[PDB]
Amino acid sequence: YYPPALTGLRGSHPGAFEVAHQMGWEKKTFDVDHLPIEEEYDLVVVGGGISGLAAAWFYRERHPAARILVIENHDDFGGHAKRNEFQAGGRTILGYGGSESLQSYSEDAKHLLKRLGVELKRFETAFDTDFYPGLGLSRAVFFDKASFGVDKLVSGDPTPMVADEVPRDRLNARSWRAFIGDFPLSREDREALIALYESPRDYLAGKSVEEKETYLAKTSYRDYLLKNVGLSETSVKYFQGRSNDFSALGADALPAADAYAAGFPGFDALGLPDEPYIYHFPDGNASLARLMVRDLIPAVAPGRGMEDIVMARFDYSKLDLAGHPVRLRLNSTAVSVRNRAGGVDVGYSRAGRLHRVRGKHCVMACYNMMVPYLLRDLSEEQAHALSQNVKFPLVYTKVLLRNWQAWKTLGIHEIYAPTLPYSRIKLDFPVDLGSYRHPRDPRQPIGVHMVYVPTTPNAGMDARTQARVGRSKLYAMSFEQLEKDIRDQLQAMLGPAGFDHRRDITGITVNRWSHGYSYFMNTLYDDEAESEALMELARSKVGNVAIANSDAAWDAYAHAAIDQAVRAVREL
Ligand SMILES: Cc1cc2nc3c(=O)[nH]c(=O)nc-3n(C[C@H](O)[C@H](O)[C@H](O)COP(=O)(O)OP(=O)(O)OC[C@H]3O[C@@H](n4cnc5c(N)ncnc54)[C@H](O)[C@@H]3O)c2cc1C
Ligand code: HEM
Numbered sequence: 001y002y003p004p005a006l007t008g009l010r011g012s013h014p015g016a017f018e019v020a021h022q023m024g025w026e027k028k029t030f031d032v033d034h035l036p037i038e039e040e041y042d043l044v045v046v047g048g049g050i051s052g053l054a055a056a057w058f059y060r061e062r063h064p065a066a067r068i069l070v071i072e073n074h075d076d077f078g079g080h081a082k083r084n085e086f087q088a089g090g091r092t093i094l095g096y097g098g099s100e101s102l103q104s105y106s107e108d109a110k111h112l113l114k115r116l117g118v119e120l121k122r123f124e125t126a127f128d129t130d131f132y133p134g135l136g137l138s139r140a141v142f143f144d145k146a147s148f149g150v151d152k153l154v155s156g157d158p159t160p161m162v163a164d165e166v167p168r169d170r171l172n173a174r175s176w177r178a179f180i181g182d183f184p185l186s187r188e189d190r191e192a193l194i195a196l197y198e199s200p201r202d203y204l205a206g207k208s209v210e211e212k213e214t215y216l217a218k219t220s221y222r223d224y225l226l227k228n229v230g231l232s233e234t235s236v237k238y239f240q241g242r243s244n245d246f247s248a249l250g251a252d253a254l255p256a257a258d259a260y261a262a263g264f265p266g267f268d269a270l271g272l273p274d275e276p277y278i279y280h281f282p283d284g285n286a287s288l289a290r291l292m293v294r295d296l297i298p299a300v301a302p303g304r305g306m307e308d309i310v311m312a313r314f315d316y317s318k319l320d321l322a323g324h325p326v327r328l329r330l331n332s333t334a335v336s337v338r339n340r341a342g343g344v345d346v347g348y349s350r351a352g353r354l355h356r357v358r359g360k361h362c363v364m365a366c367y368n369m370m371v372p373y374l375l376r377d378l379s380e381e382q383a384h385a386l387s388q389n390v391k392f393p394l395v396y397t398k399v400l401l402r403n404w405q406a407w408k409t410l411g412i413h414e415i416y417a418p419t420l421p422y423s424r425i426k427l428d429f430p431v432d433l434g435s436y437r438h439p440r441d442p443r444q445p446i447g448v449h450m451v452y453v454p455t456t457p458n459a460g461m462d463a464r465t466q467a468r469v470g471r472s473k474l475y476a477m478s479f480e481q482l483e484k485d486i487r488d489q490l491q492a493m494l495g496p497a498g499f500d501h502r503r504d505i506t507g508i509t510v511n512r513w514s515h516g517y518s519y520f521m522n523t524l525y526d527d528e529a530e531s532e533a534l535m536e537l538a539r540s541k542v543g544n545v546a547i548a549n550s551d552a553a554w555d556a557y558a559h560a561a562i563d564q565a566v567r568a569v570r571e572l
Contacts, residue, residue, distance in 0.1 A: 032347030048072025049079025096284025400507030
């Protein structure tokens with residue numbers, strides 16, 4: 001029993017969500033008040049992600065002898081932080097199923113990393129930052145026939161990005177004029193894009209700095225480019241999907257002020273008033289989850305420290321052993337949380353069967369939108385606040401390739417596709433850590449990472465609706481349909497250099513994050529003071545039940561997941 005080696009439809013896989021959807025969609029309720037209490041703990045944690053795991057860890061630090069149960073509905077621990085594995089040519093090749101890297105922090109977060117043996121500066125040498133640039137490789141843009149008239153792959157992209165692992169002097173980029181000159185657009189559209197970089201103008205002339213800023217927070221980037229810079233509808237399509245990965249929506253939902261702060265073009269002349277993105281374990285932040293699980297339940301794997309975790313062998317049969325004071329219980333959907341007698345009764349469903357356990361304390365570390373269906377003591381106001389945290393769907397696909405000669409031939413290590421389902425397609429980060437060595441030889445297998453976000457661009461939707469509609473679209477897609485999109489797009493982009501998707505793909509893992517990033521405050525649709533009041537109301541302590549998850553901070557980062565766990569534990 002070893003989830004990390006599974007391929008196919010992963011992420012929120014079949015079996016993880018059905019009981020939750022009976023509560024959320026059908027309003028079925030699962031009461032356990034008539035069942036005997038089976039087990040008793042000091043702390044019961046709902047949700048086995050980084051935040052739930054952190055809550056167990058900090059609670060135990062404060063209560064060394066604590067008995068702790070973690071209830072988790074996926075078939076593996078870690079939530080968004082999942083380890084993916086491939087086998088090729090005798091060796092394991094690692095990938096990240098979701099939460100990707102760390103930055104370089106509260107004292108509590110520092111204290112957690114140190115106690116786990118995570119030295120952040122180790123990545124200065126573990127991340128092979130000059131590997132792809134040293135091979136002469138650059139980032140490219142892929143234009144699709146349907147949108148631009150013809151398929152064209154344009155390399156040498158100098159566009160600077162928010163979470164950039166490439167040293168800026170090492171982009172192997174061309175000039176804006178040279179690079180844009182190759183765009184499959186009319187001469188007029190190319191001149192207009194080029195002038196965007198070569199000859200910025202004050203497109204908001206007349207307005208003071210304060211009025212410009214107000215305007216930019218209430219105007220989408222797309223509209224700013226359309227109405228103020230004057231780019232054509234065909235030009236702006238170049239920008240449509242650039243924000244898909246880091247914000248979970250396209251340029252039509254990106255506030256222009258947020259585009260400015262992300263380094264997007266168009267603002268240099270308005271008169272308005274970086275760190276290497278290399279903190280990446282070979283399986284992403286699943287290492288952080290695995291680190292905590294081993295530290296919490298030492299029978300699961302041997303060793304200690306950030307080096308040997310990478311290839312440590314986890315025995316899942318040791319996760320949920322009684323007597324062991326910390327127990328992690330997978331494939332288990334919590335359905336009921338109720339204060340009683342200075343304790344908390346927790347009900348969960350497992351293989352269709354209901355169970356009841358007790359803790360003195362409870363931390364709700366699951367999706368915040370799930371909490372109203374579980375916590376029976378919520379006022380209507382707080383339940384409603386919780387339900388306003390509408391999470392964004394994302395899909396992170398791992399693809400194993402026989403070789404990557406087609407990438408070498410095309411001179412690329414990463415593609416941006418403005419309008420296709422997958423907007424980000426890249427050879428995986430080259431990272432050597434512990435006994436794991438990143439693939440090096442283009443004749444040999446390598447992992448590809450690629451990001452698909454089911455946005456509905458230019459429809460007039462607010463962000464919450466784009467999120468919910470995105471989930472409807474994902475729900476309506478079989479694994480077969482997802483696989484076709486992968487193979488169709490890889491074939492169209494790499495086909496010209498000899499790629500053959502049927503011959504050259506030797507593994508596919510689709511991590512379906514239907515409930516991906518936490519909601520965050522979007523100044524195009526939300527009022528800041530109202531949004532903050534909703535946030536603080538939603539995470540309010542309820543008796544002996546505290547609420548965590550990154551959701552509780554409206555902030556989709558592993559460090560928010562840790563700090564919300566810390567706050568929750570201290571309240572208890
Ligand atoms: C695709 C993607 C990429 C990301 N990349 C990064 C990155 O590079 N850096 C970064 O800092 N952050 C990143 N994140 C943010 C990520 O959400 C956090 O880093 C962290 O993984 C979230 O931890 P969590 O514990 O808050 O939530 P989760 O990981 O979502 O854990 C909550 C868990 O509770 C479970 N649960 C829900 N309902 C129930 C129930 N009724 N009973 C039991 N369990 C339940 C859920 O299924 C889930 O497994 C990324 C997120 C996504 C989706
Ligand atoms: C990949 C699998 C999934 C798909 C395709 C999916 C799809 C959807 C859709 C279309 C909705 C309605 C739109 C919305 O309100 O956001 C929804 C809502 C919801 N989902 Fe999921 N979902 C999945 C997984 C999960 C998981 C893993 C959980 C919890 C563990 C979950 C719990 C819920 C709940 C509770 C709601 C109700 C939201 C509310 O009432 O506020 N779903 N999902």
